[PDB]
Design an enzyme around this catalytic site. Structure first.
Site: not given
Length: 1036
Positions: A9, A548
């Site tokens: 992983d 934003h």
RNA sequence: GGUCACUCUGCUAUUUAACUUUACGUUGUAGCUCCCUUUCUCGAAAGAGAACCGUUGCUACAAUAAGGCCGUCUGAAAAGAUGUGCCGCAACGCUCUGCCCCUUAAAGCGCUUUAAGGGGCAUCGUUUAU
DNA sequence: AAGTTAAATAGCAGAGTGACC
DNA sequence: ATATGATTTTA
DNA sequence: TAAAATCATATGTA
């Protein structure tokens, strides 16, 4: 020696790795080793570190080049006799230079100017030269920018130059050019001697000149290489050859699906169409439909077909042929009726020339001789080309012929090169070779791969070559038909929405279509304010802002869920605040309830509606880098690594969804604050994941309606977990793996960790009652490896420079603007006592707006004159700051806080330890530091280090250390060292949040310590062994 | 039959690297300027005037990582002239350099020497521009 | 903020070959 | 995230 | 008190 699968992983930050032993049917028999290797470090709080370096170097160039052009301007002023050596100081600056340049810039239009006055104007036009347009191109009662600036701006606003607060003027470089030549004429006729011909041209070119963005091999250096003939570069997309190759892959691969069956195009139809996109601008599918006659039960395979005129979409468009054609036609060197009279190899040569060069200099440079100047200039006037195909001009010269002679793409390639797979370097080696690094221009991905390979070759040196390497990639388990045709529906309408909104954008006159397409979502009314915005003015930068709502300052979101539109009035007084923190928090308010309204009433998506109104850690970021790392690693290992496995393909590329499902089936679904060690767990599930399982799962989700996320199928009949169909590698998988990966049994995290060899073996023996193969030689407990960071590079100091005049008494001062000045800051304003009316007036306004200077100072603040008259405005005031240390900067006229502690040198004397910090700036100026930390004292009075003192070692960030207090024993990764405290922070290997503050032990003292030794560790977390340095190392 | 990998093409959604500029912001210094501590000077006192220091506003100039260089022209030199002048916050890598850590063999009594081999990290070498 | 470029991957579609279940 | 000022607790 | 832990605050932008 031993037959193991190696599972990986690999994330942005870590690679977990597992080894599973297998029989000779390659079935997995037993768990050998596992580990987690972390190499986290980055993210300036919020992009990349290489990016930070980039923008530094960008500005260093702007800086240098402006300084340099101004220097050459002073030199030019002297050589053309405007100045005479008695006007220059030692350093090279002009003496008694007027500080009046705007007023003289205006006035020069009406009077002759002093040599110093004229000098001042010219240096001023060169230093502020405005922005020059850099994309392809082919006021009234005011006379010049200076005059407009002075007359309008100074009268209305009280300032000429811009400020973040009131941004008024930006000027074009072409505007300032106009001004320059205007002053050169007006000044000549008013009897200025220094209208000195050479100085006119000189000044003008220093004003006008900037380096080209792309010149020479700039493009060739970034450009990839042919799939087939890997010595030669990729072909430009605007090439005769390449455009043709595309048209043939389209044409040959085309199928018509009629009432019952599917058929290719006949040679006759291929001859019918071959020349049609050359004869028109573009060949749509409708036009093809007619020229071949077809029928009306006949359709085209894989084209949209919705509720739209789907065959209007262009089947093929020869963009470059028509671009060159239209160019010649527009300059009257070609008949619109007659075809383009230039040979293939020439269309190629010109297409590439434009694609690899942009300066007229470069592209004539390559075309001069091969093409006639009349049309060269024609094309140069009108052509811009970008983008490249995947195959050389050469390989295409060889392929395209065979595809004209009917052949399919694979048949052509197979005939010429053997296969259509491309020239690969397959040279199996024992140890995974270096990643090319020429081939990956992305340093995060490069480091992740490079660490991944250090793990791989680690387990090869320790256990020999594996049977198979299993890697987790980022692909999704094969989807059902209904699933992926709805994916296609929504992809299609993403396209279809961008043309719809793009069209109505074009109608009135990337950023741009977003502005417009967001006007409509909000029913137009600015979210915060609620004045239904003047539809016009989508170009006055500051009027309507693409704001934003959840700050990118706190959230790390730039997705299409967090940009509310509004007009400049209300984006000012919010600063860094969420729509809830901005609009009055705990209690209701006009704008807050108007916001609740607008929100409920907005066609801004259901998801976002929830995301604009919430009331910490940036969940979701760069899975793109994970994708790339893993894709490339599967390719690289498969091509160039020796393995023991049965088949020809002994690299399996599993994916996330697969291991999520299998962990579902094998009873390991759980949450991750507990440790970084879960990375090892997934690795072993990867090592046990198999091709068989990939296919069984894939057919389950694709054909039998199994959820690819939780592994459950409806039936109507109930809902069941298809758990039985996928058995675990051995009987006690959950127990064995959780114990080996956590040191605790699966049931409860409460228990002490078997943190030793024999503790673990006794726990495994005890809890796996019946499984003797679980406990063997190679059963160490899991100790997470953290890569070390031993760069002496780094940010010299913080970018905010502070006044150092009072560094004497341990203070700097800086201008806090009023709109950022809160009560605590005001208490350290320098004229707190020198002008006490000022203090009380500021404190008054702050206390009156509940200490929020964003609103406290919205209306201008003024000094008053004691008779009660209004005087000067205040915008910002100087505030004292505690400064016990710092980096002298800006020609030794300022100080700034330190940025990066490169290393800490550790000494012993009388069984006591002393730490000497070394920062990046000391490294850069060769300073080998002298004085160890002493808690409550300036460095002036710190402990000096002489031959009396025993040097033990250096600490770099993420070096492994052991401390023994009479109170306890500590072992972990060195994190930071406190100047004010002389302590250290330790990162525990697995960052187990339950110990310290989220896995960091804050404030470990080491002065009294019984022992304080530095260890070393390898990539698998094994050869943990003390290391002792002989000499205290230099800094260079 | 199915699944997967890879090649080519069109597309949807995203990411990264390199480059050229601008307008600001910060500190320093000047001028003009707001306030204003202290101290002088003239007033018989309201007041007026000056100085250092603080510091408001505007404008200019310099610096804008800490730090290292290079071409070309004059010149015995010293040094002058001159440039679309260049590097410096990343990552990789082991050919050279340096530091730590194994392992083997020899020879001495857990340590050192020799020899060889192997690994890690770099202030070493590349991308990288002279 | 403006602007010129190249590179990569997850997904959908179209043409192919070849390993593996 | 790191750097480090300011404050509290332990020995 | 000296040393060790803890809490607290700040970071260049369009």
């Amino acid at each position: 020696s031993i037959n193991y699968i190696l599972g990986l992983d690999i994330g942005i930050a870590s690679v977990g790795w597992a080894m599973v032993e297998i029989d000779e049917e390659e079935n997995p028999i037993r768990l050998i080793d596992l580990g987690v290797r972390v190499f986290e470090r980055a993210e300036v709080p919020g992009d990349s570190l290489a990016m930070a370096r980039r923008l530094a170097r960008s500005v260093r160039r702007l800086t240098r080049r402006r300084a340099h052009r101004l220097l050459r301007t002073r030199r030019l002023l002297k050589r053309e006799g405007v100045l005479q050596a008695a006007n220059f100081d030692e350093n090279g600056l002009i003496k008694s230079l007027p500080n009046t340049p705007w007023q003289l810039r205006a006035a020069a239009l009406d009077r002759k100017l002093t040599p110093l006055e004229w000098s001042a104007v010219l240096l001023h036009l060169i230093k502020h030269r405005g922005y020059l347009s850099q994309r392809k191109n082919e006021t009234g009662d005011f006379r010049t920018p200076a005059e407009l600036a002075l007359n309008k701006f100074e009268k209305e606003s009280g300032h000429i130059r811009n400020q973040r607060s009131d941004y008024s003027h930006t000027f074009s470089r072409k505007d300032l050019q106009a001004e320059l030549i205007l002053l050169f004429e007006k000044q000549k006729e008013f009897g200025n001697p220094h209208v000195s011909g050479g100085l006119k041209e000189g000044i003008e070119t220093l004003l006008m000149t900037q380096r080209p963005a792309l010149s020479g091999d700039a493009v060739q250096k970034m450009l990839g290489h042919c799939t087939f003939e890997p010595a030669e570069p990729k072909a430009a997309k605007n090439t005769y050859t390449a455009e043709r190759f595309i048209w043939l892959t389209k044409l040959n691969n085309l199928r018509i699906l009629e009432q019952g069956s599917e058929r290719p195009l006949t040679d006759t139809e291929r001859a019918t169409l071959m020349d049609e996109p050359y004869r028109k601008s573009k060949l749509t599918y409708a036009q093809a439909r007619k020229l071949l006659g077809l029928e009306d039960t006949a359709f085209f395979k894989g084209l949209r077909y919705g509720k739209d005129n789907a065959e209007a979409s262009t089947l093929m468009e020869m963009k470059a042929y028509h671009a060159i054609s239209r160019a010649l036609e527009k300059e009257g060197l070609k008949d619109k009726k007659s075809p383009l009279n230039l040979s293939p190899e020439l269309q190629d040569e010109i297409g590439t020339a434009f694609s690899l060069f942009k300066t007229d200099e470069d592209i004539t440079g390559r075309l001069k001789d091969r093409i006639q100047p009349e049309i060269l200039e024609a094309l140069l006037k009108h052509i811009s080309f970008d983008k490249f195909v995947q195959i050389s001009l050469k390989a295409l010269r060889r392929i395209v012929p065979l595809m004209e002679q009917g052949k399919r793409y694979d048949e052509a390639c197979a005939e010429i090169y053997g296969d259509h797979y491309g020239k690969k370097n397959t040279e199996e080696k024992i140890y995974l070779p270096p990643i090319p690094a020429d081939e990956i221009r992305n340093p995060v991905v490069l480091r992740a791969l490079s660490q991944a390979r250090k793990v791989i070759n680690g387990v090869v040196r320790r256990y020999g070559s594996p049977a198979r390497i299993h890697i987790e990639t980022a692909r999704e388990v094969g989807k059902s038909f209904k699933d992926r045709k709805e994916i296609e529906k929504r992809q299609e309408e993403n396209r279809k929405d961008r043309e719809k909104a793009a069209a109505k954008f074009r109608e009135y006159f990337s950023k741009d279509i977003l502005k417009l397409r967001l006007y409509e979502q909000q029913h137009g009314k600015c979210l915060y304010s609620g004045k239904e915005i003047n539809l016009g003015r989508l170009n006055e930068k500051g009027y309507v802002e693409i704001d934003h709502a959840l700050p990118f300052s706190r959230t790390w979101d730039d997705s299409f869920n967090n940009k509310v539109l509004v007009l400049g009035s209300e984006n000012q007084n919010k600063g860094n605040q969420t729509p809830y923190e901005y609009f009055n928090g705990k209690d209701n308010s006009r704008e807050w309830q108007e916001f609740k309204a607008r929100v409920e009433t907005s066609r801004f998506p259901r998801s976002k509606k929830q995301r604009i109104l919430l009331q910490d850690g940036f969940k979701e970021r760069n899975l793109n880098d994970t994708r790339y790392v893993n894709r490339f690693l599967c390719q690289f290992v498969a091509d160039r690594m020796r393995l023991t496995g049965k088949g020809k393909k002994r690299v399996f590329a599993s994916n996330g969804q697969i291991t999520n499902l299998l962990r579902g089936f094998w009873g390991l679904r759980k949450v991750r604050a507990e440790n970084d060690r879960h990375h090892a767990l997934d690795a072993v599930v990867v090592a046990c994941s198999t091709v068989a399982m990939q296919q069984k799962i894939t057919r389950f989700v694709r054909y039998k309606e199994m959820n690819a996320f939780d592994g459950k199928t409806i039936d109507t009949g109930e809902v069941l977990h298809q758990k039985t169909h996928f058995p675990q590698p051995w009987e006690f998988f959950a127990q064995e793996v959780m114990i080996r990966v956590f040191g605790k049994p699966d049931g409860k995290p409460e228990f002490e960790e078997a943190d030793t060899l024999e503790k673990l073996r006794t726990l495994l023996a005890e809890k796996l009652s019946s499984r003797p193969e679980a406990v063997h030689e190679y059963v160490t407990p899991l100790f997470v490896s953290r890569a070390p960071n031993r760069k002496m590079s780094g940010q010299g100091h913080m970018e905010t420079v502070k006044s150092a005049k009072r560094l004497d008494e341990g203070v700097s001062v800086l201008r806090v603007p009023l709109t950022q000045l809160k009560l605590k800051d005001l208490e350290k304003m320098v004229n707190r006592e020198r002008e006490p009316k000022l203090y009380e007036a500021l404190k008054a306004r702050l206390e009156a707006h509940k200490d929020d200077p964003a609103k406290a100072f919205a209306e201008p603040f003024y000094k008053y004159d004691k008779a009660g008259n209004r005087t000067q405005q205040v915008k910002a005031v100087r505030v004292e700051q505690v400064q016990k240390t710092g980096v002298w900067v800006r020609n030794h006229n300022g100080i700034a806080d330190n940025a990066t502690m490169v290393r800490v040198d550790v000494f012993e004397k009388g069984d006591k330890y002393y730490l000497v910090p070394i920062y990046s700036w000391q490294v850069a100026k060769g300073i080998l530091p002298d004085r160890a930390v002493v808690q409550g004292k300036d460095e002036e009075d710190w402990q000096l280090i002489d031959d009396s003192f025993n040097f033990k070692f250096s600490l770099h960030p993420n070096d492994l250390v052991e401390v023994i207090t009479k109170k306890a024993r500590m072992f972990g990764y060195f994190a930071s060292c406190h100047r004010g405290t002389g302590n250290i922070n330790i990162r525990i290997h697995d960052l187990d949040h339950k110990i310290g503050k989220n896995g960091i032990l804050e404030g470990i003292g080491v002065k009294t310590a019984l022992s304080f030794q530095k260890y070393q560790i390898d990539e698998l977390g094994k050869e943990i062994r003390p290391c002792r340095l002989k000499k205290r190392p230099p800094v260079r």
